[PDB]
Design a protein around this ligand. Structure first.
Ligand SMILES: CCS(=O)(=O)c1ccc(CC(=O)Nc2cc(-c3cccnc3OCc3ccc(C(=O)OC)cc3)cs2)cc1
Length: 229
């Protein structure tokens, strides 16, 4: 806590490692499946489903996704050293925000499609849910984040910062989180300088944009954290 520049580069590689081990689906794999688009008949099949079936499916995939985000935070340096309440507060407030950012990888801007259950489909795939403005907002955010051409390492380092934020209410050890955050900010800025990507900082979604689009229940976060005691 309060790291030197050599320590900061160990922290960049570390976060990038943790991300690669918990990225769920390989970027190469997602990119290669872009040609696999749902047929008009497959779309109709999803639209005919009850909102209850669709929610169950969506909830299953989001749960799976959140689990990979939880494993990502657990592998972050200093996260496991924080108290249990801070670990829960940080994950409860940020896990869905991280899933949304990570989802930009499964998004194809050419045809405005998202990878869902094995193929790519537009927002009409979610018609049954009855929440057009919400689905629209998610595709909008993904489309804006796609335009940035966000690298795997840029995502790893930015999502570490979405999670490790000392401004979350309910933090008991606020100063421990701040130290972690300051080291990750510098690790992010330093990596952007090494890769000549300083330009993306002004292009990133602003303060509150990720928060307005989005909190997980305290028990469902502890569940992902400690699945066996
Ligand atoms: C992530 C890491 S990855 O490895 O890139 C990877 C990427 C994809 C997959 C496949 C997959 O799961 N696709 C999925 C897509 C969607 C989805 C997409 C767009 C709009 N809506 C969607 O769902 C509806 C919905 C309803 C309420 C909320 C909410 O809470 O409102 C804020 C959020 C979403 C859900 S699941 C696996 C791994």
């Amino acid at each position: 806590q309060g790291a030197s520049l050599t320590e900061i580069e160990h922290l960049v590689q570390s976060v990038c490692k943790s991300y690669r081990e918990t990225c769920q689906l390989r970027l190469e794999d997602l990119l290669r499946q872009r040609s696999n688009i749902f047929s008009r008949e497959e779309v109709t099949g999803y639209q005919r489903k009850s909102m209850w079936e669709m929610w169950e499916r969506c909830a299953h995939h989001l749960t799976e996704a959140i689990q990979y985000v939880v494993e990502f935070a657990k592998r972050l340096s200093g996260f496991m050293e924080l108290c249990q309440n801070d670990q829960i507060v940080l994950l409860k407030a940020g896990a869905m925000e991280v899933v949304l950012v990570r989802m930009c990888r499964a998004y194809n801007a050419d045809n405005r499609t998202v990878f869902f259950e094995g193929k790519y489909g537009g927002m009409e795939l979610f018609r049954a849910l009855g929440c057009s403005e919400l689905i629209s907002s998610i595709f909008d955010f993904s489309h804006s984040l796609s335009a940035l051409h966000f690298s795997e390492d840029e995502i790893a380092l930015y999502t570490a910062l979405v999670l490790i934020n000392a401004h979350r209410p309910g933090l008991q050890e606020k100063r421990k989180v701040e130290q972690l955050q300051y080291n990750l900010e510098l690790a992010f800025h330093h990596h952007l300088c090494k890769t000549h990507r300083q330009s993306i900082l002004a292009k990133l979604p602003p303060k509150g944009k990720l928060r307005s689009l989005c909190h997980v229940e305290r028990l469902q976060i502890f569940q992902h954290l400690h699945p066996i005691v």
